[PDB]
Structure 1
């Protein structure tokens, strides 16, 4: 699967909010383009003069993420975060020249991402009380990944001593994206666990944090909540469900070629971190069928 690379696989079946530190520093920002950020400004002007109702928004930037030694006490993960914008994204990762920017970053900084916006995404492997994962069908009219299968998520807009508020906003934002798009009540959702971080190689290597969230509703009840908002309540064009039993082999199905890079990251991390049992009982042949 060349379109997705794993940056991080969390231990312990996934990390809760209380085990994660962030460092939000301008040292973690994108570097100015070699010939100047006027190139980004020019692309933005062209876009606004065609679509004047567009607006900029701030985004978090992922610089790097360092896991503690496994088995340790205290904080288990440090996220090194900067700030970027939707404008900077459109001028870098989304640009036809994004591969040239990666090569220049390797040359100048020994960092393929140094000249890229790399806005941080969030997504969920969202499980039902009757053991299905939730999938969404993207509109064929949107700019990114038209017509492909996705999971719930997005690219959060901002607002350890400012760090803990940043970790709180990231965990809050994946629940808010589930409430906004799937139309579920907040009180039906578990506190999220971070499964890991995945890079989207079709979008010049931008990274997304992928979470596991449990819902106390059945698949039939989730479908009812999604549909009862009507066409204007969601950006997706449909909802569907796959048994957790069958997610195990999803990369061998015809569905795999329809999943956008976001969703593929979330399913690989769910299979490695929540699936793949380690103990004698769940690892027995009747419960973990060979092949």
Structure 2
């Protein structure tokens, strides 16, 4: 799977909000481009002069994420975050010359990402009361990953002493994206756990935080809520469910070739952090079949 790399695998079956610190600092921003940010400005002008209804929006930038020594007390994760924008993304990660910007970042800064926007995405492994995960089909008419399978998520827009509010907006935004797209009531959803962070090598290495969320509704009820919004209530074109039993071997299925990279990230982390039991009971052959 060359189009996805794991930046972080969380311990203890995943991390709650209260165990994560953020450092939001202009030291974590993209570096100005070697020939000037006029190259980003030019791509944006060309785009607005064809699609003048487009808008810029701020985004969180992932710099890095440091896990504490395992088994320790206190905060378990430090997220180093900067700020970027939709416009900076279109002029860097989405650019035809994105591989050249990575090589120049290696040369100039010892960092393949130094000249990349790298907006932080969020995604969920969303489980039902009857032990299915939730999948969405993308429109064949959109620019990114057309007609591919996805999981719920988005790219949160901004607004440890502003740090804790930033972690709160990240956990909040994954629930909000589930309510907006799947049309589920907020009170049917668990507090999320962070499973890890995955990078999309097809989009020049931009990262998504992958979460586990439990719903108290069955798969038949989740479908009813999704469909009852109508075609205008969602960006996706369909919803479907795979038993948690069968997610274990999903990378061996024909479905795998149709999954967008960030959804592959979510399923790998679900299998490693929520699947893959460590104890004698769940590890017994009748409950963990070999092969």
TM-score above 0.5, yes or no: yes
Match of 2:206 in 1: 206
Residue 248 of structure 1, CA deviation: 0.0
The Cα offsets for residues 155-206 of structure 1, whole Å up to 9 and x where unpaired, read as 0000000000000000000000000000000000000000000000000000
CA distance in 1, matches of 2:177, 2:150: 13
CA distance in 2, matches of 1:270, 1:49: 42
Please list every run of 5 or more consecutive structure 2 residues that lacks an aligned counterpart in the other structure: none
CA distance in 2, matches of 1:157, 1:139: 23
The Cα offsets for residues 83-103 of structure 1, whole Å up to 9 and x where unpaired, read as 000000000000000000000
Residue 250 of structure 1, CA deviation: 0.1
Residue 72 of structure 1, CA deviation: 0.1
Residue 231 of structure 1, CA deviation: 0.1
Instruction: Say if 2:38 is the partner of 1:38.
Output: yes
CA distance in 1, matches of 2:150, 2:82: 26
TM value normalised by structure 2: 1.00
The Cα offsets for residues 96-138 of structure 1, whole Å up to 9 and x where unpaired, read as 0000000000000000000000000000000000000000000
CA distance in 2, matches of 1:143, 1:120: 19
CA distance in 2, matches of 1:236, 1:31: 35
Residue 20 of structure 1, CA deviation: 0.1
CA distance in 2, matches of 1:170, 1:109: 28
CA distance in 1, matches of 2:157, 2:167: 13
CA distance in 2, matches of 1:151, 1:88: 25
SS in 1 for 2:212: strand
RMSD: 0.2
CA distance in 1, matches of 2:142, 2:12: 37
Aligned residues: 291
1:85-234 equivalence runs, <5 A: 85-234=85-234
Residue 78 of structure 1, CA deviation: 0.0
Residue 19 of structure 1, CA deviation: 0.1
